[PDB]
Amino acid sequence: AVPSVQTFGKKKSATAVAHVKAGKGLIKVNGSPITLVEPEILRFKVYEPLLLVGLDKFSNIDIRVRVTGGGHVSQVYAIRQAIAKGLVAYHQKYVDEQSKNELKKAFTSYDRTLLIADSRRPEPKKFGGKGARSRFQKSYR
Amino acid sequence: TPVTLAKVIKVLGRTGSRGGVTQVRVEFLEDTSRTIVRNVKGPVRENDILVLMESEREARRLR
Amino acid sequence: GTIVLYAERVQDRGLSAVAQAESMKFKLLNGLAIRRAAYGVVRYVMESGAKGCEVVVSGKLRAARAKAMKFADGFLIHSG
Amino acid sequence: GRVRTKTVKRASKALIERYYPKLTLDFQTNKRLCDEIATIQSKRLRNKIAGYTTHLMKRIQKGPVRG
Amino acid sequence: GNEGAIRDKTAGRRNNRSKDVTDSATTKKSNTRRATDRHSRTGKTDTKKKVNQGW
Amino acid sequence: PGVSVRDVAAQDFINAYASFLQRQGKLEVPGYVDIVKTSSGNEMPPQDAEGWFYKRAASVARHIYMRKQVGVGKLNKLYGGAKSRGVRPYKHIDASGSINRKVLQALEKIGIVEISPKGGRRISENGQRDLDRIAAQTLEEDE
Amino acid sequence: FTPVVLATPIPEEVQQAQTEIKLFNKWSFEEVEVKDASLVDYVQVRQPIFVAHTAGRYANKRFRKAQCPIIERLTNSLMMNGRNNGKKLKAVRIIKHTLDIINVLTDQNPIQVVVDAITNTGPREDTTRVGGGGAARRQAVDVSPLRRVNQAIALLTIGAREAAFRNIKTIAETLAEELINAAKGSSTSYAIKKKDELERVAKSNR
Amino acid sequence: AQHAVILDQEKYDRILKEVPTYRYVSVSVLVDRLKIGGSLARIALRHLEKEGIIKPISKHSKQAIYTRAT
Amino acid sequence: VLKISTRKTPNGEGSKTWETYEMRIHKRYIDLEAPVQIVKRITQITIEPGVDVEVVVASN
Amino acid sequence: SLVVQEQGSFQHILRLLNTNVDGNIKIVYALTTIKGVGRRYSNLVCKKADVDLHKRAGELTQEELERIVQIMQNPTHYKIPAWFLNRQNDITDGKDYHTLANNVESKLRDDLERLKKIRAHRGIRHFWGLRVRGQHTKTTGRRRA
RNA sequence: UAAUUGCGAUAACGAACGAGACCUUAACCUACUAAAUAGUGGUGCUAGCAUUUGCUGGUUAUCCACUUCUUAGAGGGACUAUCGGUUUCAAGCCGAUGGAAGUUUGAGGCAAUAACAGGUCUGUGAUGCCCUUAGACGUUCUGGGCCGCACGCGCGCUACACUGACGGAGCCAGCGAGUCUAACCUUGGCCGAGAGGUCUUGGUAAUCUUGUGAAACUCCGUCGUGCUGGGGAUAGAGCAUUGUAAUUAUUGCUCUUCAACGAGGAAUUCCUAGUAAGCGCAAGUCAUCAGCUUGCGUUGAUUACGUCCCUGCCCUUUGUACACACC
Ligand SMILES: [Mg+2]
Ligand SMILES: [Mg+2]
Ligand SMILES: [Mg+2]
Ligand SMILES: [Mg+2]
Ligand SMILES: [Mg+2]
Ligand SMILES: [Mg+2]
Ligand SMILES: [Mg+2]
Ligand SMILES: [Mg+2]
Ligand SMILES: [Mg+2]
Ligand SMILES: [Mg+2]
Ligand SMILES: [Mg+2]
Ligand SMILES: [Mg+2]
Ligand SMILES: [Mg+2]
Ligand SMILES: [Mg+2]
Ligand SMILES: [Mg+2]
Ligand SMILES: [Mg+2]
Ligand SMILES: [Mg+2]
Ligand SMILES: [Mg+2]
Ligand SMILES: [Mg+2]
Ligand SMILES: [Mg+2]
Ligand SMILES: [Mg+2]
């Protein structure tokens, strides 16, 4: 084949997966391009990495991403992560290191976790309340 | 309206039988060379700055 | 034809809970001082190479009001 | 609160008591040492232990430690 | 029967609504005994010979 | 360059295809439209009155373009929204099986979808065509 | 800024302002400074952001919630009173709208007005119910800077929503309006009235 | 029924001449000049775009925003 | 995993403690190509009190 | 949509179906202030009558008005379902009526009394001032009648 | 210290039960073993648009390959690490750095000795004693009743709207569960506005329902502050589903009727991070019925990170004529 790597990004249940092949600078998510996405208020969340590290950067690669699970926001943070980690995976193998450290350094400076996936997760409700911490309601008498 | 800037130094402890109140010593940096102890309402760490509204009256304990 | 039964005199009954439970049953039911019964069982168990053993008797015995005893020797752990 | 229990502290003592030539303010090697030199059932207790024998060790370099 | 039922006055919301409510509606739990829970009523007691042969 | 429909955002594609089929005439729009409701989890009929059949038709079309095969059941569940059961909690409920299945026929008798094997309905060869066609029409508005 | 285009193409003002300055929805982040001393540190601005939605972790350690971008600290607190718990996208939009309105009126970096509105409403001293034996009097207290920002936010948003309740003007207009009058406190604002009256009673026990 | 649900030739002309000086114009702003209920107000915002002084900064439902033309 | 969630109490008294049990089902399959002999030689033995072995065949 | 002009053509308030209707409110909704005409029914009828739903009750040519009154009291001929209607399959001639305006008052009374005259339990329960449809009357509805 | 958790002090030294360890789940592995019941790239065969190569799909085996994502085996990993402040430089504690992770890592499971006349003889073919035992307190069968309505109390649900209702349109989860001597979960096609009907069909299940296209939510419209289109109680009339039976209306749909409620006195509950709150879903129950429960995921805050003022308990000291122990 050609130069190409696969990476991912996860935020809660959602798991966004990237295939970053060598190519002519596209970036499509699930099936459509990246200049659509929606939530769209959020839109700039996922444009972000490409700005962070300069819009060029991608003209030697094509990027595909497919999100599954998690809700409308869960996915948009998940995807942007897999995009940035996908850049850094490529320059890990196919470019030099000092570029890969150049990239990682400007992601880690701005960062919404972006390279690292966030540990946060729903805590188990326990019997006695509608929630995890939440208790019910007592009245004594 | 003579405002008075004072740099907090050394967190000395909580007062008020409630507990909300905290005792600190300050340092106006509009000429240091002098220091004073105040009561804060909110959360405080060393190197904060308090708008003392009366440069000349300090408070001790709370019940 | 499609099923079969087998007897298998288990290896040392002294470390079978069930064996000793049914023992104490058939002890007291055969008329035996409660202390004698239990303390007996704990002695056969311990002697049978146990690390430790424990016996509770709850219930009402000759008196009207219900009491309950413990009867433990040696080592036990209780958690996890 | 990460106050280390006695079994952690006790085992740690005896390990330094008789294996100071060996062990060295690196949790990693003191870990592997413990596998060889000591019997422990769980991985966590093993770390928890080595982690403290490495503590004790790391400050003995600066004076004695009572016990 | 049903003919009796609607013909019958003394019945239906109108009336009840214009009747005073007893004060026992608003009574508490009555409780009766709990401050006596620990002193046996049997008046009998066991003994110590029957207890000691027992245990 | 070339184009898909994926190249085009949701709203702009459908208000285009809706505008198409009204501009068109070749429809089949049952006739109980305007007197009908679109779900039992709804309160008022569609406000687009004269139209909105073209809205669903276009919506339906684009959806079945996007995937393998999908039928009345799926489409009913998709278009279904929350229903206030009055003083009782909201529950999702499926929407009208007629509206859709008849949009599925009207769009078929017009040749955009074909009763696919495996199941349901799947984008016709000729829809691929026309859908990628007005899609570019929607991009050429911003050229 | 020198153009760049690859396959799937990226819009002009999008390409433009982005790789340049790290500015907001599209708003200048430089300039923008904290008119009252202290109050810096405990008001963000730089690091700069695109929109004020983030997977922050400001809560699991004590003071670090200061390190949240203040503008997001506005929208965060925008989302409440029961119904609107969560609904951050809702908030976000309102703020974007809001800034636009604030900006439209009287020029000025809108987030800079948010800077001037907030700085202007944090009460410099207050009171707590000291024991004093039953009839609990009122000891004045020079209050923390952090609490001074918090209170500012809480105040601003609240009396904005209160006005915004039951009437035509959208929550954004009133949020804008509050900040506007709060820019240099003009006594016609919920927060200033409530600020000063907290200082009214703070001074009135000394 | 407290006024502002219709057109009134005087109101039309009110809209034409009374809308400079609105540093901010919007649904709400239109009702606040003691006139137009929110519905016809929204219709006006549209037909002041047709060729009328207002400059369309920012977008949509609930929120509208315009300034004077330049 | 097969949960069963229950109040502990036989009756109704007391704070409403709940308690859930579970039974873990572990299934697994392995495909082989081997003549009649090895198959049956592999089915009769390799038996175990605890493991439900099942050997289906066929291209359908 | 349209910056409209309109001369004096429109009257605020207007009386039809023996009731009163405010003009400066949208006609779909305006029409609902007749007894027995819910929002849906209002809607379909105007949709039927070739009347503009964007209009107020105000404008509406006098011809257009009368048309509405026509359709409203004859739904079966002017092609409106049957399941769209309040009183279908009567209980005498079993026709499909859409009882309108000051009539629905009397028709509730008619039914209500039909039960009582028949001594049926739902009847009795009505006369006893309670709720019929089988809800618990212990805890709920208290202030009341 | 969360802890008789330790440090220290020290006529004590050194130990065990309990706490801890442990075990379960949620987190991290491009390391290891694999997978047509999970999935990726390439190639076939093939549709659309562009055509200069492109872009977006179709194709349970037309093949070759791989295991990043999914699955679950075995290992690994964290030990509050490195450094630095703080402190009897003790246990520790606080901050920064690194880290999947640094609140017992998060949440549970388990849990010593004791006490209570706590609750359960209405789960038990567990049981003593009492009562009854053929005009039965056994048992079945027919019908009503536990729902009965001047009212007092408690858990809830829906709301009082414009951070909204409605209407189009975008379109996104995770725990589950499903039919043999049977009628369970149901895709698809028709018919019906609807509720539903009818024909077929896959699934004893990572293989089918199901990507459970769930809901808040996001978009563009309509309405405009008017008890309004907020709200949907009460009620009439009709159509359907479960069931042998629906009247005192099991549930469902349609039209209509359109109440109180304009943020709630004194009081009082719950809660510290993926928590609160909002939001729906599956499972229990279940012929039929969820405004309940048990879990689950979605959206995602504000404010503490303190204290002993209130309440609750714990430990000492102290008093005692109490030991059936202040009932
Ligand atoms: Mg334990
Ligand atoms: Mg919808
Ligand atoms: Mg939906
Ligand atoms: Mg709600
Ligand atoms: Mg009406
Ligand atoms: Mg132990
Ligand atoms: Mg793997
Ligand atoms: Mg860090
Ligand atoms: Mg008792
Ligand atoms: Mg029992
Ligand atoms: Mg019995
Ligand atoms: Mg009952
Ligand atoms: Mg309760
Ligand atoms: Mg909506
Ligand atoms: Mg029909
Ligand atoms: Mg079959
Ligand atoms: Mg109304
Ligand atoms: Mg409503
Ligand atoms: Mg159920
Ligand atoms: Mg129940
Ligand atoms: Mg004594």
From Swiss-Prot, chain C:
| Cross-link named Glycyl lysine isopeptide (Lys-Gly) (interchain with G-Cter in ubiquitin), sites | K25, K51, K60, K70
Q: Which domain of life is it from?
A: Eukaryota
Q: At what positions is Phosphoserine found?
A: S16, S48
| Residues that bear Omega-N-methylarginine | R65
Quote the subcellular location field of this record.
Cytoplasm
Tell me the protein family, please: Belongs to the universal ribosomal protein uS3 family.
What exactly does this protein do? Component of the ribosome, a large ribonucleoprotein complex responsible for the synthesis of proteins in the cell. The small ribosomal subunit (SSU) binds messenger RNAs (mRNAs) and translates the encoded message by selecting cognate aminoacyl-transfer RNA (tRNA) molecules. The large subunit (LSU) contains the ribosomal catalytic site termed the peptidyl transferase center (PTC), which catalyzes the formation of peptide bonds, thereby polymerizing the amino acids delivered by tRNAs into a polypeptide chain.
User: What else does the entry mention about this protein?
Assistant: Present with 146000 molecules/cell in log phase SD medium.
State how it assembles: Component of the small ribosomal subunit (SSU). Mature yeast ribosomes consist of a small (40S) and a large (60S) subunit. The 40S small subunit contains 1 molecule of ribosomal RNA (18S rRNA) and 33 different proteins (encoded by 57 genes). The large 60S subunit contains 3 rRNA molecules (25S, 5.8S and 5S rRNA) and 46 different proteins (encoded by 81 genes).
Q: What is this protein called?
A: Small ribosomal subunit protein uS3
Taxonomic classification: Eukaryota, Fungi, Dikarya, Ascomycota, Saccharomycotina
Its gene name is RPS3
Curated annotation (Swiss-Prot), chain D:
Organism of derivation: Saccharomyces cerevisiae (strain ATCC 204508 / S288c) (Baker's yeast)
Q: What's the protein name?
A: Small ribosomal subunit protein eS17A
Which part of the entire sequence is included in the shown chain?
2 to 68 of 136
The record's function comment reads:
Component of the ribosome, a large ribonucleoprotein complex responsible for the synthesis of proteins in the cell. The small ribosomal subunit (SSU) binds messenger RNAs (mRNAs) and translates the encoded message by selecting cognate aminoacyl-transfer RNA (tRNA) molecules. The large subunit (LSU) contains the ribosomal catalytic site termed the peptidyl transferase center (PTC), which catalyzes the formation of peptide bonds, thereby polymerizing the amino acids delivered by tRNAs into a polypeptide chain.
Mention any additional remark.
Present with 30900 molecules/cell in log phase SD medium.
UniProt-annotated location(s): Cytoplasm
Q: Can you state the subunit structure given in the record?
A: Component of the small ribosomal subunit (SSU). Mature yeast ribosomes consist of a small (40S) and a large (60S) subunit. The 40S small subunit contains 1 molecule of ribosomal RNA (18S rRNA) and 33 different proteins (encoded by 57 genes). The large 60S subunit contains 3 rRNA molecules (25S, 5.8S and 5S rRNA) and 46 different proteins (encoded by 81 genes).
Protein family according to the UniProt entry = Belongs to the eukaryotic ribosomal protein eS17 family.
Swiss-Prot record, chain E:
What UniProt keywords are attached to this protein's entry?
Acetylation, Cytoplasm, DNA-binding, Isopeptide bond, Nucleus, Phosphoprotein, Translation regulation, Ubl conjugation
Residue spans of biased composition, Basic and acidic residues class: 5-22, 34-49
The Gene Ontology biological process terms listed for this entry are:
negative regulation of apoptotic process; regulation of translational initiation in response to stress; ribosome hibernation; telomere maintenance; TOR signaling; translational elongation
* Localization annotation: Cytoplasm; Nucleus; Cytoplasm, Perinuclear region
Q: Phosphoserine-modified residues are where?
A: S18
GO CC terms in record: cytoplasm; nucleus; perinuclear region of cytoplasm
Q: Which GO terms describe its molecular function?
A: DNA binding; ribosome binding; RNA binding; telomeric DNA binding; translation elongation factor binding; translation repressor activity; triplex DNA binding
User: Is the keyword Nucleus assigned to this protein?
Assistant: yes
Q: How is it modified after translation?
A: Phosphorylation by TORC1 upon nutrient replenishment inhibits STM1 and causes its release from dormant ribosomes.
User: What does the miscellaneous comment read?
Assistant: Present with 46842 molecules/cell in log phase SD medium.
What protein family does this chain belong to? Belongs to the SERBP1-HABP4 family.
The protein's name is Suppressor protein STM1
Originating organism:
Saccharomyces cerevisiae (strain ATCC 204508 / S288c) (Baker's yeast)
* Span of the entire protein shown here: 56 to 110 of 273
From Swiss-Prot, chain G:
Query: What InterPro entries does the record tag this protein with?
Result: Ribosomal_uS7 (IPR000235), Ribosomal_uS7_CS (IPR020606), Ribosomal_uS7_dom (IPR023798), Ribosomal_uS7_dom_sf (IPR036823), Ribosomal_uS7_euk/arc (IPR005716)
| Gene Ontology annotations of biological process type | cytoplasmic translation; maturation of SSU-rRNA; regulation of translational fidelity; ribosomal small subunit assembly; ribosomal subunit export from nucleus; translation
Q: Which family does it belong to?
A: Belongs to the universal ribosomal protein uS7 family.
Q: What is its main location?
A: cytoplasm
UniProt-annotated location(s): Cytoplasm
What quaternary arrangement does the UniProt entry report? Component of the small ribosomal subunit (SSU). Mature yeast ribosomes consist of a small (40S) and a large (60S) subunit. The 40S small subunit contains 1 molecule of ribosomal RNA (18S rRNA) and 33 different proteins (encoded by 57 genes). The large 60S subunit contains 3 rRNA molecules (25S, 5.8S and 5S rRNA) and 46 different proteins (encoded by 81 genes).
For molecular function, the Gene Ontology terms on record are: mRNA binding; rRNA binding; structural constituent of ribosome
Highest taxon of the lineage? Eukaryota
PTM comment text: N-terminally acetylated by acetyltransferase NatA.
> What's the protein name?
Small ribosomal subunit protein uS7
Q: Where is this cross-link: Glycyl lysine isopeptide (Lys-Gly) (interchain with G-Cter in ubiquitin)?
A: K26, K184
What keywords tag this UniProt record?
Answer: Acetylation, Cytoplasm, Isopeptide bond, Phosphoprotein, Ribonucleoprotein, Ribosomal protein, Ubl conjugation
Give me the Gene Ontology terms describing cellular component: 90S preribosome; cytoplasm; cytosol; cytosolic small ribosomal subunit; ribosome
Say which species the protein is native to: Saccharomyces cerevisiae (strain ATCC 204508 / S288c)
Q: Which residues carry this modification: Phosphothreonine?
A: T8
